[PDB]
């Protein structure tokens, strides 16, 4: 096979992507060992779906799991009557998701389960894949001539040839695994053929963070979760929290081997210690550094010039409401709250008007990082921690460190009942989710 493993791509044909996937326990080889994972399409990750604006997607999900499941079309601004977070597909049953890809859309999205209380074990076991909306911007020469790859960042732990079960501590912290994989492979080699790489990045982990750095190189951010930036942004490192996506250009500067690493990052995970008192929670501290892949540069690399511009960000109408959503924790209970409450699918927490813009102030009053996700309605991050964001782009997950306030500009798009929640999916399963109704 190619030195660099990537999921198989399924492309729309004639404007239609019609596909049946099964969600099924699947024996496979993973990281040099045999294991049974839960997969879409018989692979880990699931197949990458590649579409264009105004394509029709018709995806029939067959549930071959022993428990109910469903799909969240993470990041897609479509109707919550399709991206339906309350729908349950029973074992053995099927459901067809059908939607049209919005016209003004580009980037890397993904699909995974969203059946409340069962997301974390289903996502941990292997149920996820990517969806790429390809754009007319892809034809500009500075992107067309780049070498493109998708990197699905997802970790795993195996016990007895199956995904390791969740412990109580895992429900508190979010589960991380010791196998830190790219596209389901352990530290693959990317032997670059071109001097400019375009890398679509997806954090499809339950809880692990990836503080990304490429040895000896900056990265050029060109898209956030839900769309292009207005122009490339040079960064020395890039933090992707669970559920976030980004696209970067890499301009290889000389021949050689360069490690792409997940550098040490402390997200606030907790352990327990007994030091002659009795059992007390103690910080785990920063993650151990991980090598994600080996990047081999071609001979005498001469990277393309960067694009001068990407996509202008829409001018949004003035907002009509300001919301405040406060995140708190009860760590020893593994319970997580928004404005003092746990999720209740019968309770509507926020009511807004379609086609207006709202300002959401989300405040992390906990000690862990929490990556806040809103379904259906992509947002513009104005500031986090009191610092203005350095670019304009559509996002749908925003990471909050302890104490920080994010200010979001939220245009409300499709009508219906949807949700917002922490994308440490264990925290969603344990209550950190609420209901938005748009009318």
**Residues forming the site for a copy of itself (CB under 8 A):** 231, 234, 305, 308
Cβ closest to a copy of itself, residue 106 vs residue 233: 233
Closest-approach residue to Na ion (CB)? 24
Cβ closest to a copy of itself, residue 308 vs residue 387: 308
d(CA 366, CA 431): 14
Decide which of a copy of itself, Na ion, Cu ion, none touches 427; Cβ closer than 5 to 8 Å per partner kind: Cu ion
Report which of 341, 342, 382, 328 is spatially closest to residue 358, judged by C-alpha positions.
382
- List the one residue from 22, 43, 94, 365 that touches Na ion (CB under 5 A): 22
CB of 227 to Cu ion, least distance (A): 16
Chain residues 27-46 in contact with Na ion, contact rule CB under 5 A: 42
Cβ closest to Cu ion, residue 87 vs residue 214: 87
Cβ closest to Cu ion, residue 195 vs residue 424: 424
- Residue 375, marked binder: yes
Contact characters 203-232, Cu ion, x per CB under 5 A: ------------------------------
CB of 233 to a copy of itself, least distance (A): 9
Question: Chain centroid to CA 155: how far?
Answer: 13
Decide which of a copy of itself, Na ion, Cu ion, none touches 305; Cβ closer than 5 to 8 Å per partner kind: a copy of itself
Site size toward Na ion (CB under 5 A) is: 3
CB of 247 to a copy of itself, least distance (A): 20
Instruction: Tell me which stretch binds Na ion (CB under 5 A): 15-23, 169-177, 289-297, 401-409.
Output: 15-23
- List the one residue from 21, 30, 297, 424 that touches Cu ion (CB under 5 A): 424
CB–CB of 197/249 below 8 Å? yes
- List the one residue from 24, 284, 328, 365 that touches Na ion (CB under 5 A): 24
Report the binding-site residues for Cu(2+).
Answer: 74, 112, 114, 370, 375, 421-423, 427
């Amino acid at each position: 096979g190619p030195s660099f493993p990537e999921p198989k791509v399924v492309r729309s044909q004639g404007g239609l992507l019609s596909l049946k996937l099964s969600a099924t326990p699947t024996p496979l080889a993973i990281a040099g060992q045999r294991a049974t994972l839960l997969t879409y399409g018989g692979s880990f990750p699931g197949p990458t779906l590649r579409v264009r604006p105004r394509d029709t997607v018709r995806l029939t999900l067959e549930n071959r799991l022993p428990e109910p499941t469903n799909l969240h079309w993470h990041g897609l601004p479509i109707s919550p009557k399709v991206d339906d977070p309350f729908l349950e597909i029973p074992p053995g049953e099927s459901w067809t998701y059908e939607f049209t890809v919005p016209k003004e859309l580009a980037g890397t999205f993904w699909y995974h389960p969203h059946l409340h209380g069962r997301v974390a074990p289903q996502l941990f076991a292997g149920l996820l894949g990517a969806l790429v909306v390809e754009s007319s911007l892809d034809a500009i020469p500075e992107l067309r001539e780049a070498e493109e790859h998708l990197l699905v960042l997802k970790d795993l732990a195996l016990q007895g040839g199956r995904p390791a079960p969740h412990t109580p501590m895992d429900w508190m912290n979010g589960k991380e695994g010791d196998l830190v994989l790219v596209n389901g492979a352990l530290r693959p080699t990317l032997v670059a053929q071109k001097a400019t790489l375009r890398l679509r990045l997806l954090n499809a982990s339950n809880a692990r963070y990836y503080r990304l750095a490429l040895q000896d190189h900056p990265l050029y951010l060109i898209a956030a979760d839900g769309g292009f930036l207005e122009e490339p942004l040079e960064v020395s490192e890039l933090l992707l929290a669970p559920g976030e996506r980004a696209e970067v250009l890499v301009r290889l500067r000389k021949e050689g081997r360069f490690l792409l690493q997940a550098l040490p990052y402390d997200r606030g995970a907790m352990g327990m210690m007994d030091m002659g008192g009795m059992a007390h929670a103690m910080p785990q501290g920063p993650s151990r550094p991980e090598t994600l892949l080996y990047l081999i540069a071609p001979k005498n690399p001469k990277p393309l010039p960067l694009p001068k511009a990407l996509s202008p960000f829409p001018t949004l109408p003035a907002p009509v409401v300001t919301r405040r959503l406060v995140l708190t924790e009860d760590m020893m209970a593994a319970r997580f709250f928004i404005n003092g409450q746990v999720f209740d699918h019968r309770r509507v927490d926020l009511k807004g008007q379609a086609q207006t813009v709202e300002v959401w102030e989300v405040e992390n009053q906990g000690d862990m990082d929490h990556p806040f996700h809103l379904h259906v309605h992509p947002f513009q991050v104005l500031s986090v921690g009191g610092r203005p964001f350095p670019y304009r782009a559509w996002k749908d997950v925003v990471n909050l460190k302890a104490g920080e306030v994010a200010r979001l500009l939220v245009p409300l798009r499709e009508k219906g009942r949807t949700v917002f929640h922490c994308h440490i999916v264990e925290h969603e399963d344990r209550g950190m989710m609420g209901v938005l109704e748009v009318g």
